[PDB]
Design a protein around this ligand. Structure first.
Ligand SMILES: Cc1cc2nc3c(=O)[nH]c(=O)nc-3n(C[C@H](O)[C@H](O)[C@H](O)COP(=O)(O)OP(=O)(O)OC[C@H]3O[C@@H](n4cnc5c(N)ncnc54)[C@H](O)[C@@H]3O)c2cc1C
Ligand SMILES: Cc1cc2nc3c(=O)[nH]c(=O)nc-3n(C[C@H](O)[C@H](O)[C@H](O)COP(=O)(O)OP(=O)(O)OC[C@H]3O[C@@H](n4cnc5c(N)ncnc54)[C@H](O)[C@@H]3O)c2cc1C
Lengths: 411, 411
């Protein structure tokens, strides 16, 4: 009957709104006002694929579907090692159904407003242990949905599900107006710079209207680990243009007239991919359940965090509704995470952690073959909607060859 | 716009009805009349778990939900090797949401009637190559949904996805009235007879009303490979009672007054688990796409064939709808199967093929631990709704121990 959620983020608000519509009382804690989120710094590039978008549609929460530009495909380019300014790999494939990127600066505050209008109890405070202890006394279940926030470290790191304990990439985002649209269809335009990093870009919707989002990932200490000395919006734009001129001049051609969407449409940072145990025990002995990035936090190189957020919240909502009047005890909490992890997120996570490492031979054979075998490119593109479909052929050389043959036979 | 389906079975009719509601023309071929199916032999024990049932609900096809008894859990019993007539393992766990078994003898004919009333073109013929050649000339896509029927061998066996080339179990079904209901909740009551076979039983709905379905699986050539000399309905009932008296007398206690639901509520047979390539090329060079059991055929020991049928048809329908006016070429066909196989059915199949083999030590430790660690029993029970959640802990000793610890910590 009464649910508390700490952290007014994508997963937490989607869950909270779903719970209100099913007739629960929901208390939510936010450490920011909607307006400060709208006008603050960008948090994400939030490219959501069709299955995740459908989850929002089914809750009536796709309020931006008409105004957000669609992302219709996935592209991959790799610089030619010899021939200057050219590509040795350059292919694209259409997504079976469109993806969309609606800035969290728009979506989170709007969902916060809707949460209130639907009877959600929104409480504004930077919550700590004391708030969790209070919630667990007055609610049948308390979830922590606080992203990369500090209170997330209350959940114990799960070392066996976390192969990394340091950032594998130095990250940056630049939201821009004026980029030349991709033709003849839009796409996430991935650029793999061997041994250096990745640049990818795609159209999106933000607070000033349609834009494109540039995403930069640098191998730590290499030429694209290059944001430390950047201090102003204008130096950020300039450093962004520098990466494209230096490593992806074919993309620089689209960017001769780009401006920032706004001075806060920028970000630089890094974090270690981490998986945590989903049940935390408070000093009183009461329990809380972690949600989405609190328990599964991946590097954004695969564009999956917001997709995880939506699918995680959907799985948790289904689990709550099926429990009915049952107790939300530690076993039910652990089982809810297990279905999410074993059934889905372990595969998103394994795929992403593999891409962070240097690519093995069979993987380079797959990326190259895809430019000549369209069914295999199509399998790569649409694997972004459900990364389970990468297994076992992406991870294993012998299977990659069998799958290349399957694809070649229907080309 | 125009779709042909050969084989009026569960997957084919669910797909066909979904397609009619989305506004397609659908031609369907059946080699039997509805009435001969209603009054013919049983085909299945069709235990459907909640996710599969929800697929039917979302199409408006759960016409029996109110009258079919619910299956509320999963149980496992193992005879005590020493102590006569007792069990060394005996536990149960509730399903998070009910399963249901609606006899195909009821469901298929009713769906055939609905298919006609919704404008489906139902054509009665035992279809062969000539019918496929005709369909492919007059339809944008032709699917083969013909189960274990003969025309299914037009699709090439996929040897790498088929570890078996012979039946691993001798099968039998007996639908009965008069069995003592399980208390305090219903369940699939599995009985593992080491080195001999399996007996499992659960309530269901058939043409004469509620019943229970007995399922027998025997290691070939052992004491439960015992249907060859059975020739009459009465010898079938008697042989069924014999297995229970000999190997599971605790279940025999429930059966002192059982009768067959009808003389055709019996079946005995066997088949090799097989996976096939989904695209078949006709003599003319045109192509057809196989569906459900045509391309993924598992032994029924895990109760997954009808669940696969529903999830396969759902995945194929989603793929058709997203293609729109696009061509149903061999690449699109192969991609549709790949999403089903890599994303889901490879895991159902690996789990099932492992259970068919003698169980390794870590698996026997898991089954035993579950009787003392309720969260682990709960994970076993609800894994039937999505067998992806068995991996990797069921298949690997080291991971099985980590998961037993996870479960024990929240018990
Ligand atoms: C640079 C970058 C790029 C990304 N690009 C993509 C992409 O293209 N596609 C994609 O799918 N994913 C992407 N992601 C990931 C995605 O943004 C996240 O994984 C997703 O938002 C997770 O949702 P969440 O609900 O778990 O957390 P969040 O959406 O981050 O919610 C956390 C919120 O909780 C609040 N909070 C924190 N602590 C407290 C507290 N103590 N009390 C109260 N409130 C608190 C904070 O204000 C914060 O807004 C990207 C992430 C980053 C960092
Ligand atoms: C003994 C047994 C027990 C089972 N128990 C379970 C259980 O408890 N739970 C579970 O989930 N699954 C179970 N299954 C599996 C399940 O019944 C099937 O996997 C499921 O029906 C597959 O659906 P389908 O649409 O692919 O095929 P089907 O439902 O079998 O449809 C095939 C139909 O096509 C028709 N046909 C064949 N050839 C042609 C042709 N040339 N032209 C026209 N029509 C044709 C036939 O008349 C037939 O009815 C069991 C199976 C068996 C054999």
């Amino acid at each position: 009957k009464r649910i508390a959620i700490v952290g007014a983020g994508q997963s937490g608000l989607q869950l909270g709104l779903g719970l209100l519509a099913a007739g629960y009382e929901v208390t939510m804690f936010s450490n920011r006002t909607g307006e400060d989120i709208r006008r603050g710094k960008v948090m994400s590039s939030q490219c959501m694929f069709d299955t995740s978008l459908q989850i929002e549609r089914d809750l009536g929460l796709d309020h931006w579907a008409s105004d957000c530009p669609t992302v219709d495909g996935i592209g991959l380019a790799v610089p030619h090692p010899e021939q200057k300014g050219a590509k040795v790999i350059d292919w694209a494939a259409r997504l079976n159904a469109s993806a969309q990127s609606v800035d969290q600066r728009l979506k989170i505050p709007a969902w916060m407003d809707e949460f209130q209008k639907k009877g959600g109890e929104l409480v504004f405070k930077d919550a700590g242990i004391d708030e969790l202890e209070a919630c667990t006394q007055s609610h049948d279940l308390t979830l922590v949905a606080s992203g990369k926030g500090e209170i997330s470290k209350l959940f114990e790191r799960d070392a066996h599900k976390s192969p990394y304990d340091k950032p594998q990439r130095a990250l940056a985002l630049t939201y821009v107006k004026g980029m030349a649209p991709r033709e003849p269809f839009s796409a996430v335009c991935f650029n793999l710079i061997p041994g250096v990093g990745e640049y990818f870009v795609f159209p999106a919707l933000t607070t000033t209207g349609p834009c494109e989002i540039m995403v930069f990932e640098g191998v730590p200490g290499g030429p694209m680990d290059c944001w430390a000395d950047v201090k102003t919006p204008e130096e950020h734009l300039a450093r962004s243009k520098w990466i494209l001129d230096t490593f992806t001049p074919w993309e620089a051609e689209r960017c001769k007239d780009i401006e920032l969407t706004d001075d806060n449409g920028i970000l630089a940072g890094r974090f270690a991919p981490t998986v945590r145990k989903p049940v935390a025990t408070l000093p009183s002995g009461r329990k809380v359940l972690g949600l989405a990035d609190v328990v599964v936090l991946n590097d954004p190189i695969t564009g999956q965090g917001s997709n995880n957020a939506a699918k995680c919240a959907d799985t948790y909502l289904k689990s709550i509704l099926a429990r009915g009047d049952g107790a939300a005890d530690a076993a039910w909490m652990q089982q809810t995470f297990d279905r999410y992890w074993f059934g889905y997120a372990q595969w998103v996570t394994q795929w992403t952690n593999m891409l962070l490492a240097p690519p093995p031979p069979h993987v380079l054979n797959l990326l190259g073959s895809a430019g000549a075998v369209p069914p295999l490119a199509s399998a790569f593109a649409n694997g972004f909607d459900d990364p389970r479909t990468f297994f076992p052929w992406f991870a294993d050389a012998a299977e990659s060859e069998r799958y290349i043959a399957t694809c070649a036979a229907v080309a």
